[PDB]
């Protein structure tokens, strides 16, 4: 155990060891100068936490720290080998080079969950 | 075959601006009671392997602190007596009993008709106003300095001006990255980052030429400037050791309560018991010379070993920028500090700085909102550390002269928020993995 | 083998303090229009098997209600006329026409120069001020009582003072525990607990010696004290049956609108049509004697059967403490409750309490914020039940004397929030069960 | 059906019969005196509910009223028999006597969830 | 066999009222800087197959916008100079130098004693007040019109009254339905409904008889009324083409800064450089006749082809309702508009409307809060389009007369929020699918 | 793709094709006139989104756009044929005629989830 963002500089596999220690710190009077700043900090934390949880639920990954999906890696986002990604590279470096493919990746996860959920309903209806 | 795998809670952050609330460990101006109680044991995590870019001159924490400090000052002056009835013609005479040579003409014994609690009855009262608060109208006739510029509000005597440390704490989903590098200028990569929930106790000390009551550099005197080659950019010096400054107001002043309306009291100045001496500050001559010797030693790095570094006093302007203005025990001193920055440098005793007192205070360089600081009974004496300077250079094409600066109060708190930055935690990450959803 | 099992939604609560919002079923001082509409059918659940510890003297609901009532009072006086020009010298003569023996000198006919709409003009107006509002300056010269102490603000005549019941409702995740025990003295276990979303209609009735228009005890007169053996602790009596009291102001007063500035009107008192009689309160002699007989019967339990219980009047202090102060129809009475607490107890007719009127009111024992209650046109008459008392005992080493108390308004609302308690629902619980996760 | 906290004094089993009635009541203008109190009450309720849901989801029990897990009963937390626990005892007493092992139990649930999610991802990779 | 199936995110909405926040694409009165930055590309979605009911006369958006505009106006006048010393006796003479026949007696040269920055000194200054702002007291003695009724607050000269478009945006979980029907009335089903996140730029233009700066009808002039057969309901006409109105205030007015206290400046009117002419507005005679020809053509549909439609001027009432009041560069005009509604209809040139200026302004039909509009230096000229009318019909049992109306500002913004509607998205739906939970 | 409420007029089946596009738009300073209105809208959106998510979790349908349950569809609610519902009718018309049976349907979904979760706990306990 290292603490909040303890594995920030650790490798991806080592960072995935303690994904929860950063997961539980994303959520946790008069109208004076400090009271208003305190109130808008509480509402901002609630909204920011809820937006990520909604995205996970949209992709069918709510309640799971690690979730596998059914959308392919296009090999244009990143062609790096798996060994050097999880043993020689950190999460901060990952987002830097894939900051622009994020939205298209998110959209792919969106349709995959809805497509397979219709398939689950149709298969189960038999 | 690689499948997009989504991870939650990954340690990824981006630079962002957010509202940082207060935490704190008689009522203050800063309302530190309204701050949430900080944890008894701060939780700091060292982010090994991490190298993050910092910039204190583009730091939003300084700008947000400036707005909060002004807002806290404004909100403590709302439920306070408005001294609009004080804007009346004054018949001021010269305070010339038991005064020394340095205090001749500095105090004015002003008498004026005043409003009584009964609207139809007047009240002839007198008060002692410093020469810096009254301006002659052309015994002679005087008026308060603010009467043609601002509406003056008396500071509530029960509200303390003492800087209580405040911790600026980021909300959940945000982190504050503390740079723990000891040789760190305000700009550039800092390969010793750490994540603390929120900053150390930063005292909102208001001063212009010398940074009092501050945080010392860990190893050596640090010279920090936005552009060291630009003479229009202030130079923030930080001392590795504190220079003690003794600041006293020898006059044994008495607060006199004048009832100027129903429920409104104007706290005037009564006669001083004893002799009237000049307010002053001593800084040790030996300690100051050593500190200047260290300042020039780290100042030659940015200007060459053969350059001539000379310290001269202020160049001109308002009394706030030309003098070491600060607040000591509820009274605002304006110290000359011309014997401090006076030597030139080439390859038990004390320095007495003659200070002057003001009661009508225009603070934050705002025109329109003046404040009356009520007199403090007794003798005021405070001991502080000079933990830094604000030097300004003069243009040239072999010698470099450094004069003290100030005015902008964001320079004062930038020396405390230089090591901190606010980041936005991004816990969603995608990475290809052999795992496939069933 | 026992593997833990986490359960969500378990019925577990812990004692906690939270912000309880208002619910309520012409504008009002307490903005019940800003309260959320309560449900037509309150949902109460009887918690069988449950025994919860209560404490009315450490209850935070009482302290929170005190702040809310003061805040509501303060915010209704903000957009109201400030009577700062009324602090002027008054030329007052006694109102001696068509007055009775008990009103000799109680009313003053005060004339004063008053500011009109035009800044450069003055008007000579007159008003009828009660003797308790004007103090002589040494016809004679008088001044308003508040003028050396407070800035007076005239209460807005369109804002009603009538106490509308308010329900203090806890947010989601919190519950309010209601004691159903009819013999509960406010401290200790409560074998009959019920959970309601929020409290019954608690009228913010302001009174000192008698608890008017309150909640009656179900079975017997209840004596409730923090420490019955301590004479410095007020004794809260609750009546099982109501004692009806009619309080009237026989004077047929007229409200006169004096325009004291642009958009500002000061509602003065015109001449009374008819004779001037003393305001008074009726209390049935038979009903009051029976209630004291029940109070002493329930008071001998804590002091012995052979003790002598004597009721005496208020010892001394402010008029708010020594008199049954209350608000009736927009005017504040201060009653001579000495014919009530007069008897000594050993092992059609009415009691008239001569009350006195005040217009300058210092509520909540606050020094600095006075209020002017504008005159009420016509004859004021209000009917209320005395649903309790606030008795104070005197120290001794065979007789016990009980004098009326008051002053602290938290004791008035403590008699309504005694059965209620705020708890924090904790829905997460862990238990060992023969499960194993897959 | 008894209502909100209707089974507060009932046994463990009877209380577990109707966890939902208490589960659904944990979540459900001008800046005047009452308006700010109402707003702060709303925000406080929202954040309390979200903290509880986050704790549930950290242990992999989101969306389940009864979730049973993979960390042992240490027998120092309690040694009472199942019959007397679930037939002769109430949740109030349970929490009262296990108010102090709660944090270590929560940490055990956290680590168990993370470990089993790692195991699921590794087994699914085959 | 059919088991229920819950679907999340279904496109179902219900009519509801919510708080719509502002979005916007020198400080302004309506604080459009405080509005969140709207998206550069609005996301508008066409809802084909959808027929939704609309009603612009029971629309809550209009009522909500009225409160927001009043609240925005009130908050911009809080940190502004209170001209309570202006309520003093004035010695006014007519401005008779270099005036035309139409300005004889309209301007008053008022001299008065004003408080200076010193409390004990008076200042004799003069200012030019329009005849509509001063009322005689019975050179002659005058006073400001509001001095018996309202407390006047000078509008801050650095805050502009120019209507900046504001977009009323619904929160998440709410949608705004936009009717794209180009022949859409105010009430009834709309075959062509569409969802947009929030409305177009709706300029809060304040006017009474003519709807300026507005949104034009797509195809033809649209006549909208709550009940076309009721003469007590205003008729909202919308123009398919804009009628250009040119409004000028020819006088070269000078703003004179009179310092009435510490930090308080009252901006008076100095002498006009040059001749003094009457403020006026030009509407093209050819363009206005054509638009009336289109209005009557669309007005005969609700009243018959053989009816006689006559346009008469406004009936009696306040100057706000009898004149085309509007705001032009910070100065409030009150234009007669008796030559506009002048003709009777049976089955290069310009119209000059003589306007009158006012500085003391009472808007929102509120009594008690007046505002002083400071003079604008130089000549003011405005170019606007008349995009609609507010007509009022007179009762009768063969001719129909239509007089201009106004007063209620909600009718001015109802002409912009007629096509919009706020709905409450309900994403939970249940359907009987054959699927059964395994 | 049609956008937010793009399938508002679509048939039941076509509307279910894009349940996600409406699902993600349900969630996403000084105390001035606009600041308070903008703050009230932020808190109102959060508590409104959380109320529907709580209901889905109550019925055991959190994280699923389409969830099938185990309570019968009474013909008293609607006797319309399946073919004419999902091919000839829109979601607006569905809620209009079943706005009154909604609460009793919600209660049936409430009890089914708790009953089946007791069965899952008891069956697994063996
Ligand atoms: C830098 O820090 C020092 C120490 O914290 C500050 O000096 C302190 O100043 C306060 C008033 O501002 C002094 O408190 C006062 O003490 C007197 C005498 O006991 C008492 O009569 C007053 O009511 C008040 O409590 C405090 O003693 C003093 N500490 C010392 C002298 O060691 C100093 O002001 C700071 N520099 C600033 C704020 O510029
Ligand atoms: C205890 O409760 C009783 C009943 O609510 C209160 O009596 C009522 O007091 C109000 C004024 O507080 C009286 O209102 C007045 O009524 C007249 C006639 O309609 C009207 O002209 C006045 O403007 C005003 O509204 C009301 O008539 C009176 N009625 C009864 C039944 O007594 C009593 O004041 C309360 N006692 C308290 C709060 O101490
Ligand atoms: C600052 O230093 C001066 C001297 O440098 C101090 O003044 C001396 O005060 C002592 C009493 O403590 C006298 O006996 C001396 O005569 C003074 N010297 C002078 C006037 O030259 C002064 O007290 C110091 N102030 C502080 C430490 O607050
Ligand atoms: C309280 O009681 C007194 C008498 O005990 C009432 O005063 C009497 O009122 C009646 C009219 O109702 C008169 O005829 C009598 O002359 C009054 N005096 C006496 C001595 O009887 C008084 O009105 C009562 N207070 C009320 C009704 O508010
Ligand atoms: C207070 O006043 C009420 C009247 O408002 C009195 O009630 C009346 O009492 C008489 C005699 O008992 C009855 O004849 C009336 O019918 C009652 N009127 C009612 C109930 O409306 C009451 O007695 C007075 N209380 C006291 C102590 O004098
Ligand atoms: C409005 O129209 C009038 C004429 O109908 C304009 O007045 C004329 O102004 C010109 C200067 O541009 C003079 O040469 C004429 O003598 C004026 N005619 C008169 C007074 O009858 C007026 O300028 C127009 N105002 C505008 C366009 O704002
Ligand atoms: C004019 C008005 O207020 N409402 C009308 C209504 O009377 C009419 O029935 C409907 C369609 O004809 O169009 C709308
Ligand atoms: C930093 O990197 C080294 C190898 O370069 C690695 O062994 C170490 O674990 C990393 N730091 C952390 C905290 O993981
Ligand atoms: C009083 O002091 C002032 C300094 O402000 C000086 O100008 C003046 O000459 C002095 N008067 C006397 C009589 O010393
Ligand atoms: C107070 O006012 C009187 C009025 O005549 C004047 O004589 C006197 O000098 C004044 N006193 C002052 C201004 O101190
Ligand atoms: C500041 O520090 C950075 C990194 O250590 C360095 O690159 C730079 O030269 C230093 N000076 C300035 C003026 O940025
Ligand atoms: C007026 O009343 C006062 C009591 O307030 C009294 O002292 C005085 O004698 C009275 N004057 C008369 C009755 O003339
Ligand atoms: C009003 O003022 C005049 C001024 O002299 C004074 O004579 C009169 O007595 C005053 N009237 C009062 C105080 O009622
Ligand atoms: C109230 O009842 C409790 C019940 O145990 C008892 O302990 C307590 O002494 C009682 N209080 C008084 C004042 O009698
Ligand atoms: C001044 O103007 C007024 C109009 O308000 C008029 O009645 C009066 O006759 C004028 N007097 C002169 C001398 O012009
Ligand atoms: C100012 O006051 C003086 C006092 O006598 C008066 O004569 C003069 O007319 C006033 N000036 C005005 C009202 O403009
Ligand atoms: C609208 O109706 C037509 C025919 O009824 C249908 O083909 C079309 O798909 C519908 N619109 C949508 C968005 O489904």
Residue numbers in the entry:
A (entry chain B), D (entry chain F), F (entry chain D): 519 to 546, 566 to 663
B (entry chain A), C (entry chain E), E (entry chain C): 33 to 57, 65 to 138, 147 to 185, 188 to 306, 309 to 321, 321A, 322 to 397, 411 to 460, ...
Study authors write:
VRC01-class members, encoded by the immunoglobulin heavy chain gene segment IGHV1-2, include a five-residue light chain complementary-determining region 3 (CDRL3) and are characterized by high somatic hypermutation.
In the 01_D03-complexed Env structure, but not in the unbound BG505 SOSIP structure, EM density was observed for residues 57–65 of gp120 on the adjacent protomer, suggesting that this normally disordered loop becomes stabilized after antibody binding.
